[PDB]
């Protein structure tokens, strides 16, 4: 760890601290996630073991790269690719002017490519929020912070309950579902999509029940037709107020018909019907950006 010179502290969590660092020889800048092992009662934290093993196997242009794992002294250093900006700060900087639609489309396309890659490797991110989406100077945006991620089996079993930051948390999580998988990440990305368009959090709740009701007030209170099994879920109550779904013209005014269609499908109540990341890439909203590949009907 002699060739790296710490430049600035950029982050801090329960695991440890994140620094920006500069290679003294090559001039290369990286991000160091430092874990102090003398302070840890259970050895390498479960979240670091998971994140390291997952990222060793998740190399993709829209996923922040894990470059190296260095054990030195009583310390474990995770060395990452460094990006100078996150989407949350970019949205706030763009709040008065707005993000141009082609950049919103390009960013969403890229996030869906990174997510489609995670999901085909059977990995749930489970903490997609603008503060975890990193941006470089060349127009790329990348998924970061896999500390809450989890590989899922085929089939899944019951995993850690009450995941995802509250504003980006899917309604099936809030109502206490036993099983979940890739749909929770799509919901978060849908919230983020709307947030890029309107420059305001779509559902900024301050408690689980307030988050749920903010969802109900915008998408309508779900029932058995739109979401089979919703009335049998642990936290569902027949006493919930009945609100009517709002016209997306009023929810995301700037967005055209294609965007409204894609957003609706990413915010479908039923996790079984909510659009997949792979399918979303094929949506007409991106028909200008992408060209499909010939499919072998064999």
């Amino acid at each position: 760890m002699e060739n790296f010179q710490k430049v600035e502290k950029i982050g801090e969590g329960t695991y440890g601290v994140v620094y920006k660092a500069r290679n003294k020889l090559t001039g290369e800048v990286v991000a160091l996630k430092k874990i102090r092992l003398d302070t840890e009662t259970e050895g390498v934290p479960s979240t670091a073991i998971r994140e390291i093993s997952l990222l060793k196997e998740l190399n993709h242009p829209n996923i922040v790269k894990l470059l190296d794992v260095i054990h030195t002294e009583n310390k474990l250093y995770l060395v990452f690719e460094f990006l100078h900006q996150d989407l949350k700060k970019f949205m706030d900087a763009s709040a008065l002017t707005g993000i141009p639609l082609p950049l919103i489309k390009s960013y969403l396309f890229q996030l869906l490519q990174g997510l489609a890659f995670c999901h085909s490797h059977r990995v749930l991110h489970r903490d997609l929020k603008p503060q975890n989406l990193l941006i470089n100077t060349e127009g790329a945006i990348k998924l970061a912070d896999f500390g809450l991620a989890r590989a899922f089996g085929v089939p899944v079993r019951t995993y850690t309950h009450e995941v995802v930051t509250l504003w980006y948390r899917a309604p099936e999580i809030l109502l206490g579902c036993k099983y979940y998988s890739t749909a929770v990440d799509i919901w978060s990305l849908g919230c983020i999509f709307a947030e890029m368009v309107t420059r305001r959090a779509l559902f900024p709740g301050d408690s689980e029940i307030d988050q749920l009701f903010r969802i109900f007030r915008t998408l309508g209170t779900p029932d058995e037709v739109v979401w089979p099994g919703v009335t049998s879920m642990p936290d569902y109550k027949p006493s919930f107020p009945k609100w009517a779904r709002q016209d997306f013209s009023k929810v995301v005014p700037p967005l055209d018909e294609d965007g409204r269609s894609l957003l609706s499908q990413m915010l479908h109540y039923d996790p079984n019907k909510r659009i997949s990341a792979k399918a979303a890439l094929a949506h007409p909203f991106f028909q200008d950006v992408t060209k499909p590949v010939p499919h072998l009907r064999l």
Binding site: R50, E57, S120, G153, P155, V156, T158, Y179
Partner: protein, 274 residues
């Protein structure tokens, strides 16, 4: 060949290929104990059996046991000249890493120290987990023997909905097949066969080649060698009878088949070598 149905969330052949490609990144050496001339194969069987008992006591998932088994076998293949008194430390540290990867609320470090009857301190376990994870190049996400059996049981019990992610199959036949695999993993010669082949050959013994091919994708020729090897193990299980699904205090019944169990399998392992 691929047995997955069409997947709403990804290209079925993509998901399968990645699963298959992974099993080529994770190497196994059925003869790795020749790197450690002071060890014998029975020692590995005794160690693995002990880890199985440990898992049941703490209600650890079968997946957790098989990760520990996989970390131990791959780690040993990177080392040389290990002595028998070091085995308990490598095993329990393998299980420590595995539990931290897999369980929602893993047991604490001192509990892993506790079950060694003081032959392994917490400090030694922390040293050993770093040695293992570094020697494994932090490649800690294998497809376990039991994970394959999980995939096979879903596909066998698929409806017209082709929903592959929400579990749906009889718990009691799952545990019966897992019992054959738990016996088989005690013998180091099992590593000759890919983990997915091992699991499919166990399933065949409890059903048929048609069902096996339908849920695993492999043709009878792929598994014939494995099935022939598993033959004595399967009969030793058949002579003694099929085990019963256990309930576990604090485990929901729809997860009860996923908890690791233990029985006198070292006795049964002897008969299979006849």
């Amino acid at each position: 060949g691929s047995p997955l149905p069409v997947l709403s969330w990804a290209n079925r052949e993509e998901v399968w290929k990645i699963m298959l490609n992974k099993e080529k990144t994770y190497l196994r050496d059925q003869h790795f104990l020749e790197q450690h001339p002071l060890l014998q194969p029975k020692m590995r069987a005794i160690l693995l059996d002990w880890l199985m008992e440990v898992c049941e006591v703490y209600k650890l998932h079968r997946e957790t046991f098989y990760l520990a088994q996989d970390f131990f076998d791959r780690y040993m293949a990177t080392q040389e000249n290990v002595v028998k008194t070091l085995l308990q430390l490598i095993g329990i540290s393998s299980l420590f890493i595995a539990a931290k990867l897999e369980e929602i609320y893993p047991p604490k470090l001192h509990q892993f120290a506790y079950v060694t009857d003081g032959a392994c301190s917490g400090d030694e376990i922390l040293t050993m987990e770093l040695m293992i994870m570094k020697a494994l190049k932090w490649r800690l996400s294998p497809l376990t023997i039991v994970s394959w059996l999980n995939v096979y049981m879903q596909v066998a019990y698929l409806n017209d909905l082709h929903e592959v992610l929400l579990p749906q199959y009889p718990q009691q036949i799952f545990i019966q097949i897992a019992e054959l695999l738990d016996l088989c993993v005690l013998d180091v010669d099992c590593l000759e066969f890919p983990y997915g082949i091992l699991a499919a050959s166990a399933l065949y013994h409890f059903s048929s080649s048609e069902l096996m091919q339908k849920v695993s994708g492999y043709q009878w020729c792929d598994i014939e060698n494995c099935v022939k090897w598993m033959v004595p193990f399967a009969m030793v299980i058949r002579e003694t009878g099929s085990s019963k699904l256990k309930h576990f205090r604090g485990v929901a019944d729809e997860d009860a088949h996923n908890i690791q169990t233990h029985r006198d399998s070292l006795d049964l392992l002897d008969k299979a070598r006849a």
